[PDB]
Subunit: 88 residues, 2 copies
């Protein structure tokens, strides 16, 4: 008991989330959000080198997202660790 019919969000649902998903896709997986906020965010973009010394054309892209409190809240890039949950 103790939790009503549909509000139970599980770790399995969180594990299905992937970067790039739209709000509609998240709503299907997670259900309706409990609280929604809008604010001014900042994104920081970097070129980075894997196996340093590889040259300018071998660089890849990473983006960092900061939230309302100006604290790091997201990492966009191509790492392929077998993404289960993004992070936190």
């Amino acid at each position: 008991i103790d939790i009503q019919q549909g509000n139970v969000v599980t770790q399995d649902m969180i594990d299905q989330l992937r970067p790039g998903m739209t709000r509609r896709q998240v709503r299907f997986i997670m259900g309706n959000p409990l609280i929604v906020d809008t604010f001014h965010a900042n994104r920081w973009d970097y070129l980075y080198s894997i196996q340093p010394g590889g040259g300018r054309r071998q660089q890849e892209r990473v983006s960092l997202f900061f939230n309302d409190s100006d604290q790091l809240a997201g990492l966009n890039g191509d790492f392929m660790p077998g993404v289960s949950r993004d992070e936190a």
Copy 2:
């Protein structure tokens, strides 16, 4: 072909990043960002259950961040997978 002196960003620097870091802490680790953008973002908050039959007081918190493209760009929560990089 060879990148210039002091803007070489490595995988090791990305691995040091953690959620909650400020822009000043990131700037120390990563150097000055290549491109900076500001936009309107959305955050979606959820309570979730760690295991089935948890009860209301055993729920934890997860926050989802959506970027300018209305795509999932970050996750906030408590997972403790030994965060190397916020997945992407």
